[PDB]
Scaffold this active site. Structure first.
Site, PDB file in Angstrom:
ATOM      1  CG  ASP A 134      -1.940   1.093   1.454  1.00 26.29           C
ATOM      2  OD1 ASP A 134      -1.812   2.175   0.557  1.00 26.29           O
ATOM      3  OD2 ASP A 134      -2.884   0.732   2.010  1.00 26.29           O
ATOM      4  CB  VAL A 135       2.698   2.855  -2.491  1.00 28.14           C
ATOM      5  CG1 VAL A 135       3.584   4.278  -2.657  1.00 28.14           C
ATOM      6  CG2 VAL A 135       3.446   1.667  -2.676  1.00 28.14           C
ATOM      7  CD  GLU A 136      -3.279   4.749   1.324  1.00 26.66           C
ATOM      8  OE1 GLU A 136      -3.079   3.983   1.945  1.00 26.66           O
ATOM      9  OE2 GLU A 136      -4.059   5.485   1.519  1.00 26.66           O
ATOM     10  CD  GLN A 137       5.342   7.363   3.370  1.00 27.45           C
ATOM     11  OE1 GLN A 137       4.887   6.682   4.131  1.00 27.45           O
ATOM     12  NE2 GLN A 137       6.818   8.007   3.345  1.00 27.45           N
ATOM     13  CD  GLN A 194      -5.281   3.381  -1.600  1.00 26.75           C
ATOM     14  OE1 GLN A 194      -5.255   4.553  -1.223  1.00 26.75           O
ATOM     15  NE2 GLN A 194      -4.049   2.572  -1.450  1.00 26.75           N
TER      16      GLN A 194
END
Ligand SMILES: C[C@@H]1O[C@@H](O)[C@@H](O)[C@H](O)[C@@H]1O
Length: 295
Positions: A134-137, A194
């Site tokens: 999960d890559v959110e930065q 997402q």
């Protein structure tokens, strides 16, 4: 997907075999993030079991927050994974990008390997079908080097470079310009965007940022069910056939077919927006959306 049930029956015989055959053939796939802390085998008060998941699901993500009871992990290993595998449902462990940039692990080839080995235990110890990052930065130069190293070490055991059939999945709220994606795209099975609360008119722009790095069947867009006490993304408004979720099931990039869709908080399927109590689910939204994609 005519062979899928119109309710949440768990098929058993030739009825099951037809579902196993559907899954081996061409079709748009459905994935779901099952919030582990919401499983009935974790703590108290929960209403949904991963055992409940619909037969026609393609991928279930084990998505924990880290306060789950030991009983959840025992049940996943001994009961849930075998039962979901009996339905031809793949089970993938999700981990945040923060785990791959953890400075307790040396930022060296040996450290990337050591951290990959530790991550592979979350797959191998549970009999799982792969790993989802999960890559959110955004990442600084050192973080990017460490994450890239870990992906390249994982790619020996998971994803298209491994030859094992196991998955290496990249799920993200960012686009294909992110440096990490530019570094690790050759290791990836599926890329999951997402897209909670987003404009149907902006989907092509995002897809276009990835399309040079994948085939279209690797690409999934995600909506969110309503989380108790959570953000009101409004992806699952009534009526269903006008929802963002339904529009995502129907959306195609120009001249190509996408891989499918996923839901966040699939454990919340069909709970009304604003209802902050926990409820059982028969997965009506998941089952109908599979139908919308595979008519
Ligand atoms: C910052 C947010 O991140 C994810 O939750 C996406 O699903 C949203 O569309 C938004 O981009």
């Amino acid at each position: 997907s005519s062979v899928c049930p119109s309710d949440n029956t768990h098929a058993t015989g030739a009825a099951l075999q037809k579902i196993l055959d559907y899954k081996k053939g061409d079709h748009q796939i459905m994935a779901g993030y099952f919030r582990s802390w919401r499983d009935t085998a974790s703590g108290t008060g929960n209403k949904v079991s991963m055992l409940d998941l619909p037969d026609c699901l393609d991928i279930a993500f084990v998505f924990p927050e880290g306060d789950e009871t030991a009983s959840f992990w025992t049940t996943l290993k001994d009961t849930y994974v075998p039962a979901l595998h009996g339905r031809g449902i793949k089970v993938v462990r999700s981990v945040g990008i923060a785990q791959l940039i953890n400075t307790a692990w040396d930022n060296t080839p040996a450290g990337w390997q050591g951290l990959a080995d530790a991550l592979m235990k979350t797959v191998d110890d549970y009999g799982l079908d792969g790993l989802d990052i999960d890559v959110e930065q955004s990442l600084n130069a050192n973080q990017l080097k460490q994450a890239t190293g870990v992906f390249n070490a994982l790619a020996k055991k998971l994803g298209p470079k491994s030859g094992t059939g196991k998955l290496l999945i990249f799920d993200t709220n960012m686009d294909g310009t992110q440096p990490l994606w530019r570094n690790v795209y050759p290791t990836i099975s599926y890329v999951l965007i997402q897209s909670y609360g987003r404009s149907i008119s902006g989907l092509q722009t995002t897809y276009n940022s990835f399309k040079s790095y994948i085939s279209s069947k690797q690409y999934l867009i995600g909506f969110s069910f309503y989380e108790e006490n959570g953000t009101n993304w409004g992806d699952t408004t009534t009526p269903m056939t006008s929802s963002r979720a339904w529009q995502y099931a129907k959306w195609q990039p120009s001249g190509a077919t996408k891989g499918g869709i996923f839901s966040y908080a699939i454990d919340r399927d069909g709970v009304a927006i604003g209802d902050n109590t926990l409820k059982t689910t028969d997965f009506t939204w998941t089952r109908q959306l599979i139908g919308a994609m595979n008519p």
